[PDB]
């Protein structure tokens, strides 16, 4: 004579939350540039960035991961 | 005399929240820009930006994943 | 005798939530530019942006996945 | 001079629910029985149930009720 | 020179609810039973139950009322 | 000169909630009943239940009422 019972349970919250989130940025201010660079010689790629402002978010991360693996037997 | 009884529960949350997100921007300001560069070389490609405001969100990230896996056996 | 009762329930959510998102922006401001680039040699291409405001998103990710594996077996 | 308008508005819900409603039963289990009642006497009348289960819903209320008088008058 | 105007509103919800309402009834069980009773004398009526489950609802009330009444009068 | 305006709203909720409201009732149990009652004598009515289980709801009450009067006049 033999009874099993199997009733796992989950309930859990798995999160992430990343980058700019929930500010409040009121009134932000900014300002002036040049750039003058004469007879440049760029042996490969050149990046270049002349914002007055940047407000900027880069999120590579926050890739949640979950795993269940569940088993059972008789004989 | 045998009796087995499988009913795992999953009732779990697994998110991702990636960015600007809920932000409040008020009056943002601004400015002004020159380039005069000159007699130049790039051997490879230039990537350049002039903005006065930039505001950006790059999300390469945030991509959940879950694996969930059951079994039972009897002989 | 045998009874075998297989019921896996799954209930779970899995969400992705990326870029700019529920963000309130009031009355953003701007300006003004200048390029007076001269005699140039790009031996490969000039990728530029030229704007007053960029506001922007870009969103590779966010990609979810599931997998769900189920099994039963007598003898 | 005079002007009078009158357009009373009623877009309310009486409502009424009795009885057994919205339940779920799964696997209602049920039983044996036995009577040998001897030599009686009724001088008025058995009102008798002998079942296994009895599910039941009697429901002499429930009956909703309104009025709704309007009136004007001049002079 | 009088302008008189007259546009009263209900919205409202008047609701019962009443019995065995939105019960989740799983597995019941029950039982075995036996009566005897011998040489007996009822003057008047007998009501009787000899079940194993009995579920059961009774609702003699629930039964809303609503009145509205209304006037107006100039001279 | 007159103006009279006259536009009350009702949005009010009268409700009743009355009798077993969503429990969760789970493998409920019984059990087993003798009666032997033996030579009885009864001037009046007899009223008896022998069950295992009784799962019972008996609602006389809930029966909301609402009741409203408006009025105006003028001289």
């Known amino acids: 004579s033999v009874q ?3 009733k ?3 309930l859990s919250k ?3 939350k990343c980058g700019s989130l ?3 940025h009121h009134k932000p201010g900014g300002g002036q540039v040049e750039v ?3 007879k440049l010689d760029f042996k490969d790629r050149v990046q270049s960035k002349i914002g007055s402002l940047d407000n900027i978010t ?3 991360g926050g890739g949640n991961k979950k795993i269940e693996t ?3 037997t008789f004989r």
Chains 1, 2, 3, 4, 5, 6 share one sequence.
Request: neutral net charge.
């Open 14 to 16: 798995v999160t992430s």
């Open 8 to 10: 796992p349970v989950d």
């Open 70 to 72: 569940h088993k059972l």
């Open 36 to 38: 003058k660079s004469e």
């Open 4 to 6: 099993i019972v199997y």
């Open 22 to 24: 929930g500010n409040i």
């Open 58 to 60: 880069h999120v590579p």
